[PDB]
Design a protein around this ligand. Sequence first.
Ligand SMILES: COCCn1c2c([n+](Cc3cnccn3)c1C)C(=O)c1ccccc1C2=O
Ligand SMILES: COCCn1c2c([n+](Cc3cnccn3)c1C)C(=O)c1ccccc1C2=O
Ligand SMILES: COCCn1c2c([n+](Cc3cnccn3)c1C)C(=O)c1ccccc1C2=O
Lengths: 346, 346, 346
Amino acid sequence: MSLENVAFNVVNKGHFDGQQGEVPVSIINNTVYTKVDGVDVELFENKTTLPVNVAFELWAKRNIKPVPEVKILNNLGVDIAANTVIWDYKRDAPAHISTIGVCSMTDIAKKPTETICAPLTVFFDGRVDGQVDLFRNARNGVLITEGSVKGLQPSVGPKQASLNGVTLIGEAVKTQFNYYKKVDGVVQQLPETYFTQSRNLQEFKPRSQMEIDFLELAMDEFIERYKLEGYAFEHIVYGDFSHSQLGGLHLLIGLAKRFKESPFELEDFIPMDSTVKNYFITDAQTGSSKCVCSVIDLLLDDFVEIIKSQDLSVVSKVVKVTIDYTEISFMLWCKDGHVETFYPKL
Amino acid sequence: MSLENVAFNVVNKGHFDGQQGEVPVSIINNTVYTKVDGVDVELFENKTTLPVNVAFELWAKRNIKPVPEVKILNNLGVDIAANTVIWDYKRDAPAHISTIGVCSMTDIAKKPTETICAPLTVFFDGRVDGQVDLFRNARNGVLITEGSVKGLQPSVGPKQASLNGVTLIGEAVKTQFNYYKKVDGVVQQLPETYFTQSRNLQEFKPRSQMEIDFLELAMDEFIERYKLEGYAFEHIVYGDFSHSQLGGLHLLIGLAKRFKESPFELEDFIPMDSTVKNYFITDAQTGSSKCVCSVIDLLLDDFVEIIKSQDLSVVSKVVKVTIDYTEISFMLWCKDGHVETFYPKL
Amino acid sequence: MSLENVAFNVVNKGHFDGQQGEVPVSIINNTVYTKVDGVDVELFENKTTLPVNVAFELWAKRNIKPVPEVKILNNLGVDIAANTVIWDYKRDAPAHISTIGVCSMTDIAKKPTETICAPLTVFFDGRVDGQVDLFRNARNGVLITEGSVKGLQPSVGPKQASLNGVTLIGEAVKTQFNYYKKVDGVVQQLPETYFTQSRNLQEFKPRSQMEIDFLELAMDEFIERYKLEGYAFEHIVYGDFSHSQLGGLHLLIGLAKRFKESPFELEDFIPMDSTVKNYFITDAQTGSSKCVCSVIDLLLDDFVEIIKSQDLSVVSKVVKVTIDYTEISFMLWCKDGHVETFYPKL
Ligand SMILES: COCCn1c2c([n+](Cc3cnccn3)c1C)C(=O)c1ccccc1C2=O
Ligand SMILES: COCCn1c2c([n+](Cc3cnccn3)c1C)C(=O)c1ccccc1C2=O
Ligand SMILES: COCCn1c2c([n+](Cc3cnccn3)c1C)C(=O)c1ccccc1C2=O
């Protein structure tokens, strides 16, 4: 361990790479600086709740390969990672507060076989040599692999993974993982799940013919083509901006469509990675706004499947949907056999 | 009062909504965090000169309806608001340092009828029940309403208002208010005033045929059409970029026209809401710059009216114009019956 | 000296201009505020390693004329400036930690003729009266002028200079300087040098017919036209995104071409001004990434000249090129008389 050594690696290798060497370091203002040719240059600003120098080290020792999005790990109940740091780029902080064989200040253990780790769900990366076997010996754990594991039934994970804070479907690298989980020394069967698409509002990319049609076509043209009469897409997806309180607008693709033609404000008042997000929206054009707007990025085809697979005979009820391996509650309101609204409740 | 309760509301409702409940809270680094599933998530970064936890509470209890822009309130001499917080999004801080019936740390009173409030100009919102009557009983105050008040002559305010930091002309909600003011227990007659348009440089929207022509047409074509020869629009509005010191460029629409074709730097060295703004501009293309460039966003039609309504017989003089209810001083330079320049002086 | 006076100047003149007057000032949170109509407004946030009030003063007293880019001054070995502050906008801090006749807290001297300055390479600005003569009397120094100096052989500097953080080729102002340097009281002959173009990725402007062709034409079309077969532009300039480790992509123009069609992430892990830059790149489309990607912004014509002026008979060797007056090392890899790669090594 050495602050100056960590700094040397960041300067010379872009991250911690176990290289020998030292550079001069100063710490002020929750910030780490290094001296370059007689002047101080900022290397790291600490936005975590850890000590500046500890956060610096964990950031430097972050996983720089494609890794599961934090929301996936959280949903599977991961407490800690084996011999790596999953950096949470949404929070600009470590996904997990403790480590195993990374950093002396945050380590609870050097190896995941230590008894302190037993009650924790440890994340194992099958791409790293030996970690598949560690998962077999672990009481509680989650495992990812690129291929088959002998004697374990896989769960096909999302297409996308996070690489240095960039969520992408890898072409030059593999981002689709098989998932395995153990609880109390017993291999679990992971449930059937939809997956969120983890897209952003600005450069929203469609991933189906339906989504291409939605973005290109007008509202009534689209609803007609896919026979979505009575499912209240006008409200739920397209959004209603007629009243002071903004109605619906619960699918990300719907936001992307409007943002294209008419910008608006999104306040991310809980800035973290989560399967579904709450935003305080204010529509700049109309002045329609709402304090808590639940937004989820499902493939529109998946959302259509879900809403078409519900009974529409009651006024209001909770609808449970497994998304990203967690149970998301939706509220379904109907009237005379038609949907009034269908939105996630967090 | 309760920090944890305020936090609960922000997490669950997006703002303070008087709901019961508590969440775990940590305060570090002038920042408020809450614990979500074993990890700390940032709720609020304090950029005010108040204590972090006080600023947090005032922000949470901000007015989330369309409200007057801070510049309007400042110009009318408002010192404090009755039973609400006008959040200043330009400064990312409370518009007023004291409160009435909001927060125990900043309250000077629970109700505006208390004698401490007498010398202060209190802001009353007629949309809130009872506040019209409080204004009648108040010695010093400013009132807004959507409609008529019995026995009071109104002043028609700006078309636009601020909703959650977004200045807009409301369609789904009403943003145009009637204004009333009292001084020493006497109802004032508010002066005839122009209003600034409160637009931004990037997505500048024209609001007249003249403004559409200005943006579309070339300089000489426009000046010809509206017979603006001798009023020196070339300098004042379009701007002169021939010399090291940038000449003119005092209307926002003029900046918007050039930014469209040729980007430049604007240093907002006094970041606050004000009827007219001073910027340190540097033109990227030419290298023409000026330390103090006074810029005001008047409707071009209004600006044309003002400059055409002046005597042009003297070399230099001060011209007073009521804008946003305050007296803005302009310097008018003329030569042989022609304008040389006409710009606001702050 | 006076904090309140410095603040008065910033408020009234946009920078320090030696005007008399005072405004109320508060210092909290490494931030300087001033009181305007009963509310605090932020004037300056300190991002330097100096005391907040010292950094404020140096920033206020920054040079607001076109000045050499910091990388140029660093390369020429400048330690200090005579009677001015070169503000480093890349680091948001003073380029030099000490001053001469600027600020009482940072001054080592009032005038550069003081004996403390003898071992330091002082930067002299010939546009300022008397400083040419000070350079003649100085033991160690660097001088810039707009025109000829009697009895000194000039070095023609870059076309571009920095004006208030904006690098530009001046039209309304002169940005091309003659350079002179003295070491141990002896005038030096500055070496023949290429210059970097100091452009940015987003609004990349071509400055030759070759560069226009590169941006417009496809890869194979361009390589054919300029007979660049065997120089491995496919790898070096255009970049290879086929493997998990990103190959090549060492010219800024190459990044600009791809960013146009396909965005990517650049982590500037040493945020300073330097002749060549190291970035941690992650390609959003492919997932191809690399921790240390050396990038230099040479005019493509200059880069073509350099690579065509090398012997290609050995497997690997270091190639030294004078750029921005400093020796930049390139690694040249060849195979059977063809280039494999040619990239800067820092
Ligand atoms: C309008 O209230 C009458 C009964 N009702 C409610 C809802 N809806 C459906 C709907 C469809 N489109 C637009 C608006 N509402 C109806 C018909 C809600 O979705 C709702 C959500 C959260 C709290 C309460 C309610 C609620 O009471
Ligand atoms: C050039 O000085 C000769 C007299 N004069 C001055 C002005 N103008 C008008 C003008 C019109 N277009 C471009 C430039 N100036 C003239 C003709 C100013 O506007 C001015 C502003 C602030 C301080 C002083 C002056 C000032 O003295
Ligand atoms: C692939 O290794 C076999 C020998 N070699 C190496 C290089 N190249 C050229 C090349 C051209 N295009 C793409 C990739 N490489 C070859 C042929 C490097 O550039 C290099 C850079 C830094 C450290 C080591 C090496 C290195 O060893």
